Design a protein around this ligand. Structure first.
Ligand code: HEM
Ligand SMILES: O=C1O[C@H]([C@@H](O)CO)C(O)=C1O
Ligand code: NA
Length: 250
């Protein structure tokens, strides 16, 4: 909603289609889908709607932004993608990273998130400190996703389901381990695990737990745990919105 996507050339569109295929094979073989989803999300999640700064405009590869503590480990993702990006010189880095995030979800068995090309790479990274803090709660989540990014409460809960793939690392954030028993499979298990309590060997952040005690978030957790199709629909909507923050008159 509210989007007017730009025209790109036929050659640009051909490159998007071929890069999507190459990214599927690469991400599947390297087992790095979670890290790639995290890269796309940390690129997009810096958007501030009031100032129209930050967002998915390719700045995450700049050494200054990779140095943000919230981005520990993402230098690995940038390096992994560099040889592939060099095969598609016509594409913006902004588009390439967002495409990699869409592909990460698809190859782990998640929904097909719509993708529209045309993001232009911006020169300057946003200031540090916009991404969410795992030790904080619902008020903080609404400040970051709502007041800054302009996303809804439904989007907060569905996007938190990104933790259905991957793990934390004690050398990156300090937290450690996977949220689910199948960290390379995208399904509604994040919500099932959240509801059943703490199982040994699985992770829950304070920010995950905040979803269970908030009056608006909890019904959504319950719905997604009961209905994976509802989760997939809402996730696809929210990821598309995230990947387009500030893009295509926003
Ligand atoms: C809701 C607020 C959120 C907080 C506080 C948060 C925090 C974290 C933290 C602390 C980690 C572990 C980093 C590490 O040690 O390796 C992590 C990993 C991850 N996050 Fe989130 N995150 C949030 C939202 C999201 C969103 C919106 C997405 C994407 C839709 C996402 C996708 C991921 C993925 C896939 C990983 C695993 C990375 C890997 O396996 O290397 N997160 N997050
Ligand atoms: O998702 C990830 O992928 C890589 C590695 O496990 C496979 O390349 C990594 O360090 C992650 O956190
Ligand atoms: Na999983």
């Amino acid at each position: 909603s509210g989007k007017s996507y730009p025209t790109v050339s036929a050659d640009y569109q051909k490159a998007v289609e071929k890069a999507k295929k190459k990214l599927r094979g690469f991400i599947a073989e390297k087992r790095c889908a979670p890290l790639m989803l995290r890269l796309a999300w940390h690129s997009a999640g810096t958007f501030d709607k009031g100032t129209k700064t930050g967002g998915p405009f390719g700045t995450i590869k700049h050494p200054a932004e990779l140095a943000h503590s919230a981005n520990n480990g993402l230098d690995i993702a940038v390096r992994l993608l560099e040889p592939l990006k060099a095969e598609f010189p016509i594409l913006s880095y902004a588009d390439f990273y967002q495409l990699a995030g869409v592909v990460a979800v698809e190859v782990t068995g998640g929904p097909e998130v719509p993708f529209h090309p045309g993001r232009e790479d911006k020169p300057e990274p946003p200031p540090e400190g916009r991404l969410p803090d795992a030790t904080k709660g619902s008020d903080h989540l609404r400040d970051v996703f709502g007041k800054a990014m302009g996303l809804t409460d439904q989007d907060i809960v569905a996007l938190s389901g990104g933790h259905t793939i991957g793990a934390a690392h004690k050398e990156r954030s300090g937290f450690e381990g996977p949220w689910t028993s199948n960290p390379l499979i995208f399904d509604n298990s994040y919500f099932t695990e959240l509801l059943s309590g703490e199982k040994e060997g699985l992770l829950q952040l304070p920010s995950d737990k905040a979803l269970l005690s908030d009056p608006v978030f909890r019904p959504l957790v319950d719905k997604y745990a009961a209905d994976e199709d509802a989760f997939f629909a809402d996730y696809a909507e929210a990821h598309q919105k995230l990947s387009e923050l500030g893009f295509a008159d926003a």
